[PDB]
Design a protein around this ligand. Structure first.
Ligand SMILES: [Mn+2]
Ligand SMILES: [Mn+2]
Ligand SMILES: [Mn+2]
Ligand SMILES: [Mn+2]
Lengths: 134, 134
DNA sequence: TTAATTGCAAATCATTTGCAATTGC
DNA sequence: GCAATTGCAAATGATTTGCAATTAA
């Protein structure tokens, strides 16, 4: 039983250490959007072998190899998730900072349209919605 | 002698100083979303009687009184004078240029998304990243 | 075998701040 | 004068890195 992230690391050629074994596990099982501090605590939980730097290094390695997506919702720290199958954007509840994920290709179309109407091709974007519940 | 951002500061009731008049002058001149370091380089141009540690306190204070709006783009805080109309940003991954835009449809699809998710939309961030069309 | 990974300081990068000097109003 | 405001320079917090030992292939 290898985590979906672990499998991707193997197929990419990466050396599989004990600490990389767990950090992959952690981020394959994380439903939310943990920060480096939290990915550490969760990894350090499943085995006290890992250090902080290893987690910083490993999460940067993964993001560079398109395994994780980085996020800077604006908390002073960077947050990560396992690269999903299809692109989604993020709805953030300004009351609890819990996160809802949405799609809407209609916006995605309009974005490309807006980029084209300025001389540009769209290489990347970032859409955060902030809202209170009813 | 007087600047638009300096007059907004005299009306708000702040103690006007040589540097704070210069920074108010520099920020009135620019329209390129300059970050703190850049504002420093453009500030000393008018009067070098300013140090780096104050540019922060000024740029932060201005943001407090709502003179400035803050953008933590996808990488160093950049700033601009509080626009009269809301807009998003198209950032050039090819150069320093940054393009301002409004798409009422997007703003409206945003609202529909918050609504159908049982949210009152209280804010949003949008940034598009483009290369010149090849 | 042997090049990549780890762990731990020490070192950044951007921003904040403690405090002695020093303005403004 | 007096409360507010500058200026270093030393703290800051989240991130990176240099280096010697370890470890995966
Ligand atoms: Mn999107
Ligand atoms: Mn997500
Ligand atoms: Mn918008
Ligand atoms: Mn703008």
């Amino acid at each position: 039983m290898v985590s979906r992230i672990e499998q991707r690391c193997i197929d990419k050629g990466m050396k599989m250490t004990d600490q990389r074994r767990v950090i992959a596990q952690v981020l394959s099982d994380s439903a939310d959007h943990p920060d480096v501090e939290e990915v550490y605590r969760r990894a350090t939980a499943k085995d006290p072998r890992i250090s902080i730097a290893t987690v910083y290094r490993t999460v940067r390695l993964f993001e560079e190899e398109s395994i994780l997506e980085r996020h800077d919702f604006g908390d002073g720290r960077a947050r990560y998730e396992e690269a999903p199958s299809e692109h989604h954007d993020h709805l953030i509840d300004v009351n609890s900072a819990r996160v809802i994920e949405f799609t809407s290709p209609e916006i995605e179309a309009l974005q490309r349209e807006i980029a084209r109407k300025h001389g540009f091709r769209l290489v990347g974007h970032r859409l955060e919605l902030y809202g209170v519940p009813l």
